[PDB]
Symmetry: C3
Subunit: 64 residues, 3 copies
């Protein structure tokens, strides 16, 4: 399905098309596609995760 | 021009101001400005490209 | 507060929930949360800054 919504009572903006979503809340911003591609922004920083992440042609590998 | 639109018949949300665009589809999310700055998110990962990309002050150079 | 708005006279789309904002203008796109987490996209490239930035589990440290 698809949802585009802005609500204040409880404060959220959501844009969604199936599994692709952008959400804004007082805690920050999340962009995601499916279950494992996610960019999250919060007051304290940013997390970027993806099965493959490429930045200007160079792959950023996983660290555990 | 400028466009902000949500459509389901065919499933897409688009936010555009001239050459700056964010689009959501069932395939993922794309953010772009002009023809060569792009962040794309898909089920399988993320690509980030820009003439200059800086992350926390450090430049990420191009790899071919 | 919360704001979701599209204006053309002067050309801007803004999505905001308290300190979390996404703005599109002819100059590009900015996503931010609070005062120091920011992703900016412009015709010339991309800047990503956050108190902590992690990409696929690896921290990207600050360079001055």
């Amino acid at each position: 399905g698809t949802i585009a919504g802005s609500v204040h009572v409880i404060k959220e903006i959501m844009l969604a098309v199936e599994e692709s979503k952008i959400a804004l809340t007082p805690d920050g911003i999340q962009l995601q596609v499916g279950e494992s591609t996610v960019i999250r922004l919060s007051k304290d920083g940013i997390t970027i995760v993806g099965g493959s992440v490429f930045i200007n042609g160079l792959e950023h590998h996983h660290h555990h």
